Amino acid sequence: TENLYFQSNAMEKIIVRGGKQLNGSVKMEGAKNAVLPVIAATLLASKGTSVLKNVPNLSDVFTINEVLKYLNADVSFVNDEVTVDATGEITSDAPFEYVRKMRASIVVMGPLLARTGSARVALPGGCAIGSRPVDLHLKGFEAMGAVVKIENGYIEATAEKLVGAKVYLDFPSVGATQNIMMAATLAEGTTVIENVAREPEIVDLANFLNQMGARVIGAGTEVIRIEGVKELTATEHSIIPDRIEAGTFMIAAAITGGNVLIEDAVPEHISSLIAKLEEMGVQIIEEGIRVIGPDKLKAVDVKTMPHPGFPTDMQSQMMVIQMLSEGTSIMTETVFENRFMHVEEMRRMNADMKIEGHSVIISGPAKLQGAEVAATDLRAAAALILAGLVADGYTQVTELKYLDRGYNNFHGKLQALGADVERVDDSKVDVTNLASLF
Amino acid sequence: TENLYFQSNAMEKIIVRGGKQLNGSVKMEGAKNAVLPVIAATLLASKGTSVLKNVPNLSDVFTINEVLKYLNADVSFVNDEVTVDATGEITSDAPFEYVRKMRASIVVMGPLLARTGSARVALPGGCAIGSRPVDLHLKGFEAMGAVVKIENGYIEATAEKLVGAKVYLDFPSVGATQNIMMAATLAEGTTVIENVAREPEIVDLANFLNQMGARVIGAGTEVIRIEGVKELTATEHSIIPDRIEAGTFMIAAAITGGNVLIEDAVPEHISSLIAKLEEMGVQIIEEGIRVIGPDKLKAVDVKTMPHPGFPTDMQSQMMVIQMLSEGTSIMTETVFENRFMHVEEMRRMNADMKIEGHSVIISGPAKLQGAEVAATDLRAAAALILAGLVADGYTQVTELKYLDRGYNNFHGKLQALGADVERVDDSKVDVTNLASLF
Ligand SMILES: [Cl-]
Ligand SMILES: [Cl-]
After folding, report:
1. Which domains can be identified in chain B, with CATH numbers?
2. DSSP code string of B234-248
3. How far is A50 from chain B (nearest CA, A)?
4. Which of A251, A265, B213, B249 sits a CA distance of 20 to 30 A from B330?
């Protein structure tokens, strides 16, 4: 009955034939950015069995589940439901190489530090952006009385007496906010975390800690206060819908002059995006969000900001609609200033863009052309596929491993909206006759 | 007259009382790692009836036999002999759920692709290590003119004209080497497979393909060349002895200061292990391998490597002798970097070890203590039982399903060597009086 994870074949391709208008309905699954921390949080429950629902079928979920089992928790994953029994004696080490491959593994430190007093995790490695330093995580645990360190590819934290403390975050880190908040739940005393991430995933996690008996207030604001308690008890919780996936289909509908109904979407979680699309001429209706694309798109400048500002996860995709707008526009990053590796791939599709500082000058309207493009990361993978919907000809997108890390049956959903999209093995494709497919 | 497979009861236990010196003789059965591919290879024989001897009584053998019968071959298994009549029209589908449970099922793709031109097998699922991706298998078949894919939990391959081709394996995969080599036997033209596995099981399989009329040279070296032929004819073949099982009893004799004669063992197949044990002070004699354990074990570092290097299948067991050595040592994996799930169980027995990267720092000599341990996999199951032989007190090993997947009457053989070991049902055991047993 347990869910099985199936590997995909290397070098598979998503071939898109542009020119089709999207029309229909699309349902969203749970957010990956919300589920990992929620699963990790189950380690805090010394009583009862946790029941998580609306859990997406993604690789990181299976991986995190394996980590928890190794931490001595009984985990089960059937359909979209995960069950966690963490009433036993929980261990504190997650050292395998597979732990490094999953950059989000660090999320178990807070819960372990609070539940067991120690945590050891293998670091993922890396230097540039796409991710940021983990210093804030340690700064927070240190303030709470822990002895910390990064040694031999390992990040560790040990606390004889985890206590409450005032912590100021240099920047609103989602990861740091999550770890510090989770660690605070069982610390002796009160913790005040300033300049925290305000993303919806943080609020959902705060709600979950509260349902388990924690005392966390302020989630969603710039300040979170946690009054530590002796113990937390298991409960049931549903993972919030993926607001980013919602944004991806909104843009797809907007650029194809479509009419799509995005089901199970919370407009409040993507106000910035909505407001920005409306400035371009797109109609957004809260029927449950319906998106109707216009004939022409008005050029508009966009600047990523910590939530509730414009989300960095919609950046690469937003650039697609910017390229099709009537005039020059600019996209700027203030969250991840180096997240523009997809620009060179969009050029192959005839895009006209220039990287300058931490901004990209986009010269629209561009007459996109089909080409062989390689995804550079999760959101970029989807961005290229969106470009394919509007490009003249056939677009072949490779490196699907990135797409699969956050989008389930992405091609199938597009097909259901009337798009000419197919996902095939490399051996099936004969470039001289892509028309054969479809 | 047909052999029957009997289920064992869930939660059975192997209780070991350490302190006994092993002395005597032990006979080895056929290797599981050798028999599955050999059985699958019988599908290539369009003429005659195959007679396989020295076939071990293991679950996977019964399972593979059921698969072949479904592929329309007549199979018979009596005593240690399997007979296969594959002269009929052979089918190409192996889709049942029981096919997924056996991770080795993929071995029938090569033979089917060569014999029928197509193959469809249900994938086992899984993400981390213990097993590796099956991409190499498909890369090879693709190079040979096949259209392949992994879709809906199924791996498939179809070839209008299977032809010879040059194939380079990213890593020396035993599974990939086997499938590609078998597929090449009936392909039109010559196949050159580079960077192949050199394990003894590969050589034995190559010998078998040759006895059937194939033209395969280079097995055992880093390059295998196969000149495809029109048809293969049935023959007789004996499965080579299980070199790993031989290693298990060698270590058992070595750690108990014993004198055991391992009958029907090929020293050439385990040179690395032998050479490594000798560095620790163990005497190994080619009488047919006799092992005499010393009073003290000298500490030594070990690094797993593809054959002829130190075998990964002896890794967990080798760690036991490393723990008892006079000083610190290190065990490193280069084949399966995550194969250290047994470390937490050895700790319960008072072992002192640290997982770092893909290495484990072992602080010996450890004064092992009896405890309740759960096997995590085949080789780990045996490793824990070996630790039990030296531990002070009683060691209870559960999850015997893993042990049974590769060791036949393991407890009986140890008893015959003078060990205080018993395999009982959970209902027979009264923890407050284990002495009662024995
Ligand atoms: Cl990514
Ligand atoms: Cl196993």
Report:
1. 1-29+241-438 (3.65.10.10), 30-240 (3.65.10.10)
2. --EEEPPB-HHHHHH
3. 24
4. B249
